Write a protein that binds this DNA or RNA. Structure first.
Ligand SMILES: [Mg+2]
Ligand SMILES: [Mg+2]
Ligand SMILES: [Mg+2]
Ligand SMILES: [Mg+2]
Ligand SMILES: [Mg+2]
Ligand SMILES: [Mg+2]
Ligand SMILES: [Mg+2]
Ligand SMILES: [Mg+2]
Ligand SMILES: [Mg+2]
Ligand SMILES: [Mg+2]
Ligand SMILES: [Mg+2]
Ligand SMILES: [Mg+2]
Ligand SMILES: [Mg+2]
Ligand SMILES: [Mg+2]
Ligand SMILES: [Mg+2]
Ligand SMILES: [Mg+2]
Ligand SMILES: [Mg+2]
Ligand SMILES: [Mg+2]
Ligand SMILES: [Mg+2]
Ligand SMILES: [Mg+2]
Ligand SMILES: [Mg+2]
Ligand SMILES: [Mg+2]
Ligand SMILES: [Mg+2]
Ligand SMILES: [Mg+2]
Lengths: 153, 207, 257
RNA sequence: CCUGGGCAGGGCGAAGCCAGAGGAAACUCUGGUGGAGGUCCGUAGCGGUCCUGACGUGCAAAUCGGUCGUCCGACCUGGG
RNA sequence: CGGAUCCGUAACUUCGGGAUAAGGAUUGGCUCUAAGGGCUGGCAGCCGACUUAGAACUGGUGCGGACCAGGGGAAUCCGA
RNA sequence: UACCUGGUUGAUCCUGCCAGUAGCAUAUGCUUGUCUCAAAGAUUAAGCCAUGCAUGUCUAAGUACGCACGGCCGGUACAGUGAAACUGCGAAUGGCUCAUUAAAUCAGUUAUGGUUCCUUUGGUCGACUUGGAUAACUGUGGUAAUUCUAGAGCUAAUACAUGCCGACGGGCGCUGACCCCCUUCGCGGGGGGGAUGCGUGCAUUUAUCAGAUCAAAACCAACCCGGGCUUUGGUGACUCUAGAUAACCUCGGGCCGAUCGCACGCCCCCCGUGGCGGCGACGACCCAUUCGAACGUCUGCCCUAUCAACUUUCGAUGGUAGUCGCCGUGCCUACCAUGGUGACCACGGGUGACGGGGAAUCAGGGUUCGAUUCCGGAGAGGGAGCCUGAGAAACGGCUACCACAUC
RNA sequence: UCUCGCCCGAAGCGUUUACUUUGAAAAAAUUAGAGUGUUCAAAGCAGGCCCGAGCCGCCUGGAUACCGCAGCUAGGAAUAAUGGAAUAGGACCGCGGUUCUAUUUUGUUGGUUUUCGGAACUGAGGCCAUGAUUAAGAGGGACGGCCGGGGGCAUUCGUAUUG
């Protein structure tokens, strides 16, 4: 569906299929972009429904530059999440390390489901999407502990 | 004196950044020219690098593309309805990049007659308009070719475009920037987008 | 600052021009041309400093506008015209035909060449495209944009170019086993057979090469100039085969004197 | 003392209650709901600060005009 | 000054207040725009309430247009 | 030079600091024969400036009727030197200073596939010369004057403008009278030629269509031959480049030489009154290289908690459309969601803080400076705005306010 | 895996780090350091050989080392944390059906059906030695024979002091 004023990326909808009268499907003309880099386009971009300007597999967002990895911390921002990159810093004087982290925002494409908090995600450099969002979610890697468990209700 | 700069902003947190530049030249800002629907009037703008930018203060004619049949014709602009980004610009009748224009559907009637003969949109009278409708008599097998164009391609322009052709107005989405290139160029709303914007305009006139 | 830079200091000049500290403050700024500043060599440096033809630069400025020195067949009126790697310098009166190849130390080594090879010239393809009315174009690192080139030319190739007509001939590709010469980085002036290329999706692929007497070095595709076809160099290269032996072997050569 | 009668509208927003956030815990923060009070502006009602105003053989052997204090109470008031 | 809306509110303190502290902006007329509901059906259609916010235009800077209606601040003595 | 010594006690040992010791870099005192290099108004005052200089520029080749010089010199404009001016380019580099500035600038590493780019280097560039305007110049002037200027006359061009010829019309698309073959009594069914009318090229602005790895068949209606045939390139990716389709291409109008010099010969011949024209400076729409800019990605900065919550009506974070900008950007607007950062020190202050490469200090480890000659940033008394120009929010450019300050 | 020309190249490819050895990596000047008798030296990158001027001359240098931390590549797998499967929703082999497209050959064109390349779902059994390191002179919990002026509540007793 759509809850905005227009969502139609590139593909022209009207093939004028009206020759004898049939409803047919409409999910076939979808712009299907492969990012390369040995990274698989997920099947949610094949048989999905979303229309996103900033999607790495649907929109015109070219992935270039650097490939980093973070851990998902928050979800509460619309179509973009905040990751944390833990790293160590060598200090010359005392001759051991310290923990430093920089919380970055990254555009979570709506094809990636099961994006629960605590999984290592791969991010890629792109053009500046907004003021704080420069990276783009590339591949969700970690299963975030155990996925087999279920609880009451 | 408008600066579109990003150094007068707060940081990722919200700490105030200290100003030290003086709003430099490579980050210009020029005031908005809301393009009206009057006659044709386009000024020029010098660009960094010596390029030329065409500022349309008000426009009358435009160039509009039919979607399916691939027929792009010149079209006088009638009215601006449902900009859907700022409802003040609907009242102001301002042409922007993604806006909706009432195409005068006259220049598509002649092409639809010349290519898809036995036309429609003729007020269900069938007695007026000596257009030279049936004068050339369609001598050779190109009459049969037009029969292929009319019956095998079947010419279905189903009831939305039927009612719009009978009313004489047509719904268009602009695809060009009137403030940058100075052109009112666009395409015709077709099918699902057409019924979507028609539902939005009907709901806006309702509530 | 505002606009482009227009002066150039001797201290901020690149090392391979063999300039001085006590002599002058400013360096000869090379004008815009087919070569960037870090990989060029001006004509005033080639004449005043290198061959020792004129003590001052004003004499070089006088003779280059008295129409003696020409580059690639046509006369350059500028005293600071940029030259580059694999160019033909010829001056019109005696046997003085200088190729600009790279010394093993990293300098623009002089090379007097016979006219039968000085008529010709190799050049590396920079990229390939198509243009007006669907015709192909080839862009050279020497800023040669030639139309209707060939269909069998990869991006990283070396094509022999004529100096009189500007016509291409004798293209050679980037294959395992060809003879190449590294032009950039810490291994510039290194002549060796292409041994292995390793592709990377980060748009900078690495290449390991070997040469004679068992030595190997790694470099990048932006710094490789293919020069031959399987230990068969198309251009005669001076001072041996262009090999950095050892600092100790250079000292042993000096002791052999 | 007994028995009846009466007091327009607004402002402040206590306890209690709900939801969200933080914390290991103690608990804390934010946004609502709530309507407490010998609580504030103010009318009728009740008194009378000032003009030391008007009269001052006056309307009147103590009144009148503005300006007033208080007005859910230790409030005002009829009859027995 | 005085009503109302939106900003912003000090010394001190029993932490409740001081406080409508102090100090500013808007307020008219006419067109619009958006939001806040009920009743009928195996997501659609009918019916009415007065509020708020924003925009444009216009009048001789006029707008609480009459009426309604807190001058304020720093202190001292006494009495909570 | 991996270095200690004197000092608390009547005397000893210890913690402890003070004082001596040696460079560094600022000032000062005393003294001074030779020579080679050699810092030098930074610290307080990025306080104020008299005076004099620091940005001008001509090739055989844009414009020469200057009154200035003079070729032999006759006449059919112009031999040449040529002051002055119109034109073009530069004055956006260099030089000087460190006052703001604490993930801001810088430094190492990455990319613009999200942009522009003077010049240079290559591709591209398919009417026997048209029209006004004006300077230098000549006379006339203004006030106390400026690098001040109106008005009278004059003429120029690569300043401004207008604008055809060549070139056959090739080919394509849409219409398109007519025409060829077979069958049907005809109607009709199928295939094949074809004048006129309309658009055509590159770039801009749209919209649509087709676009690369894969090998055996089974039938239905037509036909080419004696069972049997056909195609732009690249990245890791594209909405890249390149095709075709229909229209726009905007008066403040994209290109398709109304430029200039050189030495001069030949040819059909009907004069040459026409061609044969070779080299060289101008940018000329566009495409790449080159000089550099621009906003981005990872990482890195001193002290302070007597700076523990900060940010958001006046965007703080994100999403969707739009505006502006050269392009991606909450850069700006409308609507919607309540986000964003922080005890791993954010936020708020101070720096006698420009950042680096570096400098001083001799075990190692560290400590302290770096305004300073190389790179980058910022400013031209404060801050604001802007023309020209490819490049400036320029200051040895302009405009207005404030403080000084000249006639 | 022989998927693309019995072995070899390419590609499937790391679950991602921390640490190390290469290599690329940048700008010089500066620092250490090679050569060079600037009269030594501070320096600078210069200079040196034969010729009675008679060689229209030759030869060589202007290197190297460091450039932390951060990023890239190729190896190492000890140490330091991370998940493999435990409600089986495990890994392998090959069989059942549903469902979907492209292009090679039937001589081409338009229409239908397959084998075929695999994506998506699903059914049954066999194969795993079928899958949980034993339990710190680590820790938490449970038991049961005690322990103690440990704590709280209520009670009882005792002189003495004062009246
Ligand atoms: Mg309405
Ligand atoms: Mg009270
Ligand atoms: Mg009060
Ligand atoms: Mg009262
Ligand atoms: Mg009284
Ligand atoms: Mg009274
Ligand atoms: Mg009285
Ligand atoms: Mg009286
Ligand atoms: Mg009162
Ligand atoms: Mg009261
Ligand atoms: Mg008070
Ligand atoms: Mg009162
Ligand atoms: Mg009292
Ligand atoms: Mg001391
Ligand atoms: Mg400068
Ligand atoms: Mg400072
Ligand atoms: Mg807004
Ligand atoms: Mg030391
Ligand atoms: Mg040390
Ligand atoms: Mg910068
Ligand atoms: Mg400046
Ligand atoms: Mg000054
Ligand atoms: Mg200046
Ligand atoms: Mg000055």
């Amino acid at each position: 569906t759509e809850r905005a004023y227009q969502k139609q990326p590139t593909i022209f909808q009207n093939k004028k299929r009206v020759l004898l009268g049939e409803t047919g499907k409409e999910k076939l003309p979808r712009y299907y972009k492969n990012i390369g880099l040995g990274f698989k386009t997920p099947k949610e971009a094949i048989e999905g429904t979303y229309i996103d300007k900033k999607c790495p597999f649907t929109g015109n967002v070219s992935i270039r530059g650097r490939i980093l990895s973070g851990v998902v911390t928050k979800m509460k921002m619309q179509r973009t999440i905040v990751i944390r990159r833990d790293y160590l810093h060598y200090i010359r004087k005392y001759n051991r390390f310290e923990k430093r982290h920089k919380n970055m925002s990254v555009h979570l494409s709506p094809c990636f489901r099961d994006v629960q908090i605590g999984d290592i995600v791969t991010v890629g450099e792109c053009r500046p999407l907004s003021k704080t969002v420069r990276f783009n979610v590339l591949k969700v890697t970690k299963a975030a502990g155990t996925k087999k468990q279920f609880q009451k209700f | 004196g408008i600066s579109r700069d990003n150094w007068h902003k707060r940081r990722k947190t919200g700490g105030k950044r200290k100003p030290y530049h003086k709003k430099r030249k490579y980050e210009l800002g020029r005031p908005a020219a809301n393009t009206k629907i009057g006659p044709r009037r386009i000024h020029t703008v010098r660009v960094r690098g010596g390029n030329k930018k065409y500022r349309a203060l008000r426009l009358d004619v435009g160039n509009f593309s039919w979607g399916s049949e691939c027929c792009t014709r010149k079209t006088r602009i009638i009215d601006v309805v449902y900009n859907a980004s700022n409802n003040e610009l609907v009242r102001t009748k301002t042409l922007v990049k993604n806006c909706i224009v009432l195409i005068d559907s006259t220049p598509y009637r002649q092409w639809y007659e010349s290519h898809y003969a036995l036309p429609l949109g003729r007020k269900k009278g069938a007695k007026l308009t000596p257009e030279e409708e049936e004068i050339l008599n369609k001598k050779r097998s190109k009459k049969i070719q037009k029969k292929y164009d009319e019956r095998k391609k079947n010419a279905k322009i189903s009831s939305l475009l039927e009612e719009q052709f009978q009313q004489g107005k047509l719904l268009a989405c602009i695809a060009s920037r009137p403030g940058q290139c100075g052109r009112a160029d666009g395409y015709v709303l077709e099918g699902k987008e057409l019924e979507f914007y028609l539902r939005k305009i009907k709901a806006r006139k309702g509530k | 600052a505002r606009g482009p830079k227009k002066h150039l200091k001797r201290v901020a000049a690149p090392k391979h021009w063999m300039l001085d500290k006590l002599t002058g403050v400013f360096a000869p700024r090379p004008s815009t041309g087919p070569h960037k500043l870090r990989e060029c060599l001006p004509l005033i440096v080639f004449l005043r400093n290198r061959l020792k033809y004129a003590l001052t630069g004003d004499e070089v400025k006088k003779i280059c506008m008295q129409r003696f020195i020409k580059i690639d067949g046509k006369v350059r009126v500028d005293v600071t015209y940029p030259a580059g790697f694999m160019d033909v310098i010829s001056i019109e009166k005696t046997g003085e035909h200088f190729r600009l190849v790279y010394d093993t130390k990293g300098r623009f080594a002089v090379h007097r060449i016979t006219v039968e090879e000085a008529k010709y010239k190799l050049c590396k393809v920079r990229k390939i495209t198509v243009g007006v009315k669907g015709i192909p174009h080839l862009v050279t690192h020497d800023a040669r944009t030639i139309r209707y080139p060939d269909p069998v030319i990869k991006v990283n190739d070396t094509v022999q170019i004529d100096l009189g007509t500007g016509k291409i001939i004798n293209f050679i590709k980037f294959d395992t086993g060809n003879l190449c010469m590294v032009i950039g980085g810490a291994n510039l002036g290194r002549v060796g057979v292409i041994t292995n290329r390793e592709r990377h999706p980060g748009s900078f692929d690495v290449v390991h090469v070997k040469d004679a007497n068992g030595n190997s070095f790694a470099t990048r595709l932006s710094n490789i100039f293919v020069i031959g076809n399987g230990n068969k160099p198309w251009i005669s290269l001076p001072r041996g085969k262009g090999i950095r032996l050892t600092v100790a072997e250079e000292r042993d050569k000096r002791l052999a004197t």
